[PDB]
Design an enzyme around this catalytic site. Structure first.
Site, PDB file in Angstrom:
ATOM      1  N   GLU A  87      -9.965   6.787  -4.706  1.00  0.00           N
ATOM      2  CA  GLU A  87     -10.292   5.415  -5.137  1.00  0.00           C
ATOM      3  C   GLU A  87     -10.163   5.341  -6.667  1.00  0.00           C
ATOM      4  O   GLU A  87     -10.250   6.378  -7.366  1.00  0.00           O
ATOM      5  CB  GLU A  87     -11.724   4.981  -4.750  1.00  0.00           C
ATOM      6  CG  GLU A  87     -11.980   4.876  -3.251  1.00  0.00           C
ATOM      7  CD  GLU A  87     -11.488   3.642  -2.523  1.00  0.00           C
ATOM      8  OE1 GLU A  87     -11.834   3.511  -1.336  1.00  0.00           O
ATOM      9  OE2 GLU A  87     -10.663   2.916  -3.079  1.00  0.00           O
TER      10      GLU A  87
ATOM     11  N   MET B 290       0.821  -1.189   0.000  1.00  0.00           N
ATOM     12  CA  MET B 290       0.000   0.000   0.000  1.00  0.00           C
ATOM     13  C   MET B 290       0.866   1.254   0.000  1.00  0.00           C
ATOM     14  O   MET B 290       0.538   2.208  -0.777  1.00  0.00           O
ATOM     15  CB  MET B 290      -0.942   0.022   1.192  1.00  0.00           C
ATOM     16  CG  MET B 290      -1.948  -1.109   1.320  1.00  0.00           C
ATOM     17  SD  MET B 290      -3.030  -1.263  -0.088  1.00  0.00           S
ATOM     18  CE  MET B 290      -2.306  -2.485  -1.150  1.00  0.00           C
TER      19      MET B 290
ATOM     20  N   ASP C 124      -4.517   4.702  12.274  1.00  0.00           N
ATOM     21  CA  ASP C 124      -4.690   3.302  11.818  1.00  0.00           C
ATOM     22  C   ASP C 124      -4.759   2.391  13.030  1.00  0.00           C
ATOM     23  O   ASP C 124      -4.829   2.885  14.153  1.00  0.00           O
ATOM     24  CB  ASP C 124      -3.619   2.896  10.784  1.00  0.00           C
ATOM     25  CG  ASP C 124      -4.075   1.862   9.744  1.00  0.00           C
ATOM     26  OD1 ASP C 124      -4.239   0.695  10.160  1.00  0.00           O
ATOM     27  OD2 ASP C 124      -4.258   2.209   8.542  1.00  0.00           O
TER      28      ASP C 124
ATOM     29  N   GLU D 252     -15.703  -2.139  -5.594  1.00  0.00           N
ATOM     30  CA  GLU D 252     -15.519  -0.848  -6.242  1.00  0.00           C
ATOM     31  C   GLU D 252     -16.914  -0.279  -6.562  1.00  0.00           C
ATOM     32  O   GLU D 252     -17.922  -0.988  -6.691  1.00  0.00           O
ATOM     33  CB  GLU D 252     -14.591  -0.993  -7.465  1.00  0.00           C
ATOM     34  CG  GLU D 252     -13.267  -1.526  -7.095  1.00  0.00           C
ATOM     35  CD  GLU D 252     -12.486  -0.904  -5.948  1.00  0.00           C
ATOM     36  OE1 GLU D 252     -12.611   0.322  -5.735  1.00  0.00           O
ATOM     37  OE2 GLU D 252     -11.726  -1.670  -5.309  1.00  0.00           O
TER      38      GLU D 252
ATOM     39  N   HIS E 203     -13.581   1.293  -0.227  1.00  0.00           N
ATOM     40  CA  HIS E 203     -13.757   0.114  -1.091  1.00  0.00           C
ATOM     41  C   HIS E 203     -13.526  -1.191  -0.313  1.00  0.00           C
ATOM     42  O   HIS E 203     -13.800  -2.234  -0.881  1.00  0.00           O
ATOM     43  CB  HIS E 203     -12.905   0.175  -2.353  1.00  0.00           C
ATOM     44  CG  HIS E 203     -11.479  -0.113  -2.138  1.00  0.00           C
ATOM     45  ND1 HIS E 203     -10.731  -0.677  -3.160  1.00  0.00           N
ATOM     46  CD2 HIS E 203     -10.674   0.054  -1.077  1.00  0.00           C
ATOM     47  CE1 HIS E 203      -9.509  -0.857  -2.719  1.00  0.00           C
ATOM     48  NE2 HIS E 203      -9.448  -0.447  -1.432  1.00  0.00           N
ATOM     49  N   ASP E 204     -12.996  -1.150   0.909  1.00  0.00           N
ATOM     50  CA  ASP E 204     -12.809  -2.366   1.699  1.00  0.00           C
ATOM     51  C   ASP E 204     -14.138  -2.855   2.334  1.00  0.00           C
ATOM     52  O   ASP E 204     -14.157  -3.968   2.795  1.00  0.00           O
ATOM     53  CB  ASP E 204     -11.805  -2.120   2.835  1.00  0.00           C
ATOM     54  CG  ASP E 204     -10.378  -1.878   2.407  1.00  0.00           C
ATOM     55  OD1 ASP E 204     -10.070  -2.097   1.194  1.00  0.00           O
ATOM     56  OD2 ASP E 204      -9.574  -1.550   3.276  1.00  0.00           O
TER      57      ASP E 204
END
Ligand SMILES: Nc1ncnc2c1ncn2[C@@H]1O[C@H](CSCC[C@H](N)C(=O)O)[C@@H](O)[C@H]1O
Ligand SMILES: Nc1ncnc2c1ncn2[C@@H]1O[C@H](CSCC[C@H](N)C(=O)O)[C@@H](O)[C@H]1O
Ligand SMILES: COc1cc2c(cc1O)[C@@H]1Cc3ccc(OC)c(OC)c3CN1CC2
Ligand SMILES: COc1cc2c(cc1O)[C@@H]1Cc3ccc(OC)c(OC)c3CN1CC2
Lengths: 353, 342
Positions: A287, A170, A221, A319, A259-260
């Site tokens: 995205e 990532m 995070d 998506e 999108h997760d």
């Protein structure tokens, strides 16, 4: 036409596995070091591999990998008049193409697509893909969970190798994407603070603060990500759970986060962002947007690739089109959605409070 | 140019895994049962999957698999979108007459045992004498098959069903089985090859020879006798022999030893037939090339010394084992019958 289709269908597993091996053997970078328009044999490349130096057969095995990548146009293939002019020259010469030059770590900072492609072909991902049919058969099944006994972010907290491969995939990919963002998008210029919600190890916000040094950067995070995050100039790390509480910030970023997750989880997260933003703040969604009509283009494949990965890897992940993103923001209390195309389907979508 | 090349490179792992899932869900046969020319939606396909009948979201997940295959020229797409078969996906529909298709061989080549071996492919370059399959599993492939019944089935069925379409191509071109009275298939797998030869040439007494762990699961076929043994120790006497997809498994020294065992077990005037995809002298983006490069990469991962060879290289192996006369017969897209005469 069975014995035509054997080639068309049988090559599909072979090509990515040959590519992964070539990346792991640093073939593309080794070719690059011979210079512009270099064309080098398997034995020249193997000569630059210390680990192969007591293996007489290394070049012949390497050539078997490279010739498949040449047939599939990942490498260019040629010879010389000296080679042509009772002796059989087995060794062709290989050169980089537009695709393989994206596999060469840059001289300045080591950036390339290698780390993201090593994540998406990692055993943890491929093992998930071996369970993909479960999503069709079984209500509420997640292939990753069938394969590994836990959801991906839960699993990452227990498996340091997977954590590193994912985080690095990532982070390095984020550098490439932000270079494209900074060429088109000007919305960071007026900001004094930016909170990266699910910001990974902090690379994205580190690059934003480097480009815009008046921005106070905050990276947010999960504990097992923040524990391994580097110290970046102008970045403060925060550990927590974005579904429980988002830190207050003047502006927020969600890159590769929405999108997760499925719609309800996305609305919950966006409402937590809304609650933590001031009047006039915004959250930026970055995205690859699903085009309204799919075709044979980079924009379509840039969405379909993560669409299939997220179907395997996390419940509800998918998506979305512009309209579907607008509907999430609206449900969470945002107004004035501004979709900004960047490159080949990548967008910044601004949601205003 | 990074965000153009992300599409070209990132799809490479996704397409085969989507294809595997579609084959395991029998998508191509389900489309075909509406008619070979039919164009049908994900919901219509899912409606024919009894396992999906309590899953409201099945069709939407199925659509996400199918639309990638539709973007990759495996399915046609038209305006839920409608999906149809292509020339490639017709080869994934078990034939109405006998169930044959490329599914079994493609399920073997993307099986976890094979992909796990490919994860170790770089070992063959770095480390003298390493074999990726052995690094991944702790045993060589034919030893592993003897202790792992699922893998043995997937491998044996992949070879057997593929062999039927190969022999259909052979019989269109090659007449060299006529007037044989006996044929021994050396490393014949479960015997499907020799069963098809005896079906076409009813005077041939067929013998299928393989390892005990293969012979003990082989079906009974009309006109076929199964024999278990070890081809590197001894081959049974036979008037004529077949080696299909055997020599490419092994290095030169092992091939010559096997071929000398065959020579010793043949009469004067006998022949051994080699059936292999032959490596062409120039490679490109074409079927003849990929038909050899695919098994070349697989065998590099799967067995010590295995590789694809040119006609010249096959001739050298036969000559070293005492044979004369080499007759290479092209069949289709790189597949050859190569006769070695004693
Ligand atoms: N409940 C939660 N709270 C905070 N972060 C979470 C979370 N669940 C997942 N994440 C984080 O969401 C991130 C998704 S990956 C994307 C990382 C980064 N924004 C980028 O674009 O490169 C991971 O770093 C993961 O650990
Ligand atoms: N030592 C040995 N003796 C006999 N058969 C062997 C062997 N080592 C491997 N084999 C067999 O070699 C075969 C290779 S697969 C090819 C099978 C068949 N000829 C076909 O073309 O479809 C396997 O069935 C395997 O079990
Ligand atoms: C065009 O090619 C690609 C595009 C993308 C990705 C990978 C690609 O090869 C990654 C994949 C991915 C996987 C899992 C995630 O969360 C669990 C992910 O979310 C964190 C991601 C993120 N996406 C970003 C988009
Ligand atoms: C063009 O596509 C393909 C071609 C071939 C095969 C598979 C393909 O998808 C198989 C692969 C294979 C693997 C292992 C073997 O022995 C260990 C094998 O030998 C027993 C084989 C056999 N080969 C035959 C040729």
């Amino acid at each position: 036409c069975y014995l035509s289709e054997t080639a068309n269908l049988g090559k599909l597993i072979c090509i990515p596995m040959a590519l992964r091996a070539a990346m792991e053997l640093n073939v593309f970078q080794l070719i690059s070091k011979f210079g512009t328009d270099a064309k080098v044999s398997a034995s020249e490349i193997a000569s630059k591999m210390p680990n192969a130096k007591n293996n007489p057969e290394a070049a012949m095995y390497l050539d078997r990998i490279l010739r498949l990548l040449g047939a599939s146009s990942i490498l260019s293939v040629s010879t010389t008049a000296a080679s042509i002019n009772d002796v059989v020259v087995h060794e062709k010469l290989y050169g980089l193409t537009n695709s393989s030059c994206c596999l060469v770590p840059r001289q300045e900072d080591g950036v390339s697509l290698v780390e993201e492609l090593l994540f998406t072909s990692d055993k943890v991902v491929v093992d998930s893909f071996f369970k993909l049919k479960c999503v069709v058969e079984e209500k509420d099944s997640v292939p990753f969970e069938v394969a590994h006994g836990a959801k991906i972010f839960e699993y990452a907290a227990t498996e340091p190798r997977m954590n590193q491969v994912f985080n690095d995939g990532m982070a390095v990919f984020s550098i490439v994407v932000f270079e494209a963002v900074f060429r088109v998008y000007d919305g960071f210029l007026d900001m004094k603070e930016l909170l990266d919600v699910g910001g990974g190890i902090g690379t994205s916000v580190s690059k934003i603060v480097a480009k815009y040094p008046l921005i106070r950067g905050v990276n947010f995070d999960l504990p097992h990500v923040i524990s391994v995050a580097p110290q970046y100039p102008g970045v403060e790390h925060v550990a927590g759970d974005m579904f429980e509480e988002v830190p207050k910030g003047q502006n927020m970023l969600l890159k590769w986060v929405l999108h997760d997750w499925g719609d309800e989880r996305c609305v919950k997260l966006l409402k937590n962002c809304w609650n933590s933003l001031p009047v006039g703040g915004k959250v930026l969604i970055i995205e690859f947007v699903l085009p309204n009509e799919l075709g044979n283009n980079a924009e379509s494949f840039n969405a379909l690739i993560p669409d299939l990965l997220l179907m395997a890897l996390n419940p509800g992940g998918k998506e979305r089109t512009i309209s579907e993103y607008d509907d999430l923001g609206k449900a969470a209390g945002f107004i004035k959605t501004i979709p900004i195309p960047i490159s080949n389907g990548l967008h910044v979508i601004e949601f205003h409070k």
